[PDB]
Amino acid sequence: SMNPPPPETSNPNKPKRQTNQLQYLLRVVLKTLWKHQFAWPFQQPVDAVKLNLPDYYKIIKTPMDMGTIKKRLENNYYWNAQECIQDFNTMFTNCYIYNKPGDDIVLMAEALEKLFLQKINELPTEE
Ligand SMILES: COc1ccc(S(C)(=O)=O)cc1-c1cn(C)c(=O)c2ccc(-c3cn(CCF)nn3)cc12
């Protein structure tokens, strides 16, 4: 059984910015979700080997997790806030695609997603 390589968090030829919106995504959005009691299953790539989920990466072809997002934010990997927002939405959608409705992990994603939506509702206007 094998895991794929993780999503990239560094690419020197990808143009990058540090914007106030991206700072908010790190200081408010990521930090709020990361400290949550339900954050742990989403703090690193899904380890399909250790979890005995050989079909995970057969179904999920765009993996994403908050460990990757955290590294991307700390490395100033993004050009804009929408790119980072898309990563969070990919992570939530993957969870809903792979898992059964009402599974514990789905309730955990839903709780993080509720907070995510509350925080991005107040994404600051770009300076
Ligand atoms: C509590 O969930 C986790 C804990 C630790 C890590 S880990 C080693 O990567 O740090 C990952 C997860 C995890 C995350 N996500 C996003 C998922 O969709 C997901 C889906 C299924 C399972 C799972 C299924 N079964 C057997 C029943 F079929 N056992 N586990 C795990 C996950």
83 C-beta closer than 6 A to ligand 1? no
50 lines ligand 1 (CB under 6 A): yes
Method in brief:
X-ray
How many Å apart are CA 40 and CA 59, to the nearest integer? 22
Cα dist. 108→5, 24, 39, 46, 119 in Å?
25, 23, 8, 15, 17
**With a 6 A CB cut-off, is 106 part of the ligand 1 pocket?**
no
Smallest Cα–Cα separation from 83: which of 4, 16, 27? 16
Q: Which fold has domain 20-121?
A: Histone Acetyltransferase; Chain A (1.20.920)
Distance CA 5, CA 103 (A): 27
The structural domains of the chain, with segments of one domain joined by +, span 20-121
User: No. of H helices and E strands in the chain?
Assistant: 6, 0
